Amino acid sequence: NNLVETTCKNTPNYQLCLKTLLSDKRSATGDITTLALIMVDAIKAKANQAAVTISKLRHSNPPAAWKGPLKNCAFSYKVILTASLPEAIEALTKGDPKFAEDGMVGSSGDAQECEEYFKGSKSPFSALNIAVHELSDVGRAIVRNLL
C-alpha cells in the first residue's frame, strides 16, 4: 500500500511530508483524512513550541526593539492555535474538509507574518516559523485531495 507515498507526492515537500507521516503510528492504516489529521497535529506541535518560545523571550527582559514584534507574533500564534487549527480539525472530523484548507492557508500566512515583524524579516526563532509554515503548506496540499 503506498497511500503515504502517493499522498506526499502530491505536496511541495516530499521529505518533510514523509518524515512527518511515517513518524505517527496512525499512518500505516489510516485513510487520507487521517493523514491530514496527523499533519495538523504536527503543525500544532510546532506552533505550540513557537508560542512558548515567544512567551519565554517576552519574559526574559528582551531588547526594546523586540517588544512589539514578539507581542504581535504572540497574537499570530494565538490565532493559529485557538482558531485556525481547531477549525481545521473540526472540518476534517465532523464537517466538510473544504474548510480545513482555509485553516492551513491561514497558518502558513500567520507563521510568515511573525517572522516578518522583525527587522530584516529576521526573528531569533526563524527555524520554528519556517517549520510551521512548511508543515502548513504540506497540510494544505493534503487537504486539497479530500475536497
Which domains are assigned to the chain? Answer: 1-147 (1.20.140.40)
Q: Is 96 left (phi over 0), alpha (psi -120 to 50) or beta?
A: beta
Experimental method: X-ray
Q: Are 9 and 16 in contact (CB under 8 A)?
A: no
Residue 98 annotated as binding?
Answer: yes
Q: Are 135 and 20 in contact (CB under 8 A)?
A: yes
Residue 44: φ, ψ to 5°: -60, -40
Residue 44 annotated as binding?
Answer: no
Give the residue ranges of DSSP H helices in the chain: 3-9, 14-22, 32-58, 64-79, 85-94, 98-115, 126-146
Q: Which amino acid, 92?
A: L
What lies within 8 Å, CB to CB, of 121 at 6+ separation is 115
- Report the distance separating Cα 136 and Cα 121, nearest Å: 19
